[PDB]
Curated annotation (Swiss-Prot):
This is Catechol O-methyltransferase. The N-terminus is blocked. It comes from Rattus norvegicus (Rat). One of its GO terms (biological process) is response to hypoxia. The gene is Comt. The chain holds residues 46 to 259 of 264 of the full protein. It comes from the Eukaryota. It catalyses: a catechol + S-adenosyl-L-methionine = a guaiacol + S-adenosyl-L-homocysteine + H(+); 2-hydroxyestrone + S-adenosyl-L-methionine = 2-hydroxy-3-methoxy-estrone + S-adenosyl-L-homocysteine + H(+); 4-hydroxyestrone + S-adenosyl-L-methionine = 4-methoxyestrone + S-adenosyl-L-homocysteine + H(+); 2-hydroxyestrone + S-adenosyl-L-methionine = 2-methoxyestrone + S-adenosyl-L-homocysteine + H(+). S-adenosyl-L-methionine binds at V40, E62, S70, E88, I89, G115, A116, S117, Q118, D139.
Amino acid sequence: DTKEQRILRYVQQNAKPGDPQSVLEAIDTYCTQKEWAMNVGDAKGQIMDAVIREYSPSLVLELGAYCGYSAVRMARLLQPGARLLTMEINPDCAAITQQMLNFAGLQDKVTILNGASQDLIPQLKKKYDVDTLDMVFLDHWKDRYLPDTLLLEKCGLLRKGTVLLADNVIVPGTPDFLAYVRGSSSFECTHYSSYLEYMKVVDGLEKAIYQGPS
Ligand SMILES: Cc1ccn2c(-c3ccn[nH]3)c(C)nc2c1
Ligand SMILES: [K+]
């Protein structure tokens, strides 16, 4: 059995249906118990929650779903009517994320997209009826953070005030992405530090607010 399956099994046996907070806590507890390096975790979750509150997005794109922790984290804060679109390359992770959201009672707010971001991003405008995104959470493959930011721009999916929030920008690192957004007049950037256990290293998130085209 995969780590994802076991996490889901544990949630289903210990958390309360329709209680997103209970789901998040169960995931965090189980991974802490097993000493499994979490993808996100509650401290980084707090940063995400504050971003959501501050910009009040109605349409959010998540790149990378894994077991669904971040999808549950964001969807639970969205208003009625709001949508989260989450892209996941691995069908097994997509399946676990769907079940996790169902358990949390948040499935009504989320659409899971199966495939790679390079293939799915250009389909957002017509297949998924997206005009512009309010927020993007980048948590997929490090070497696509910059390409996908450029692709989002090219497809007309960003507008002034669209928030990009990128995880793991120090470890393993996305230095080209950081150099681009920090250097570009199209983005206003803020960094947030957070420690990773086991590797015992400071990592971080970058918030980059799009300003409009150059
Ligand atoms: C090249 C490449 C690698 C991974 N991904 C993902 C991903 C990472 C974790 N879950 N899903 C997505 C949505 N698009 C890509 C593209
Ligand atoms: K900048």
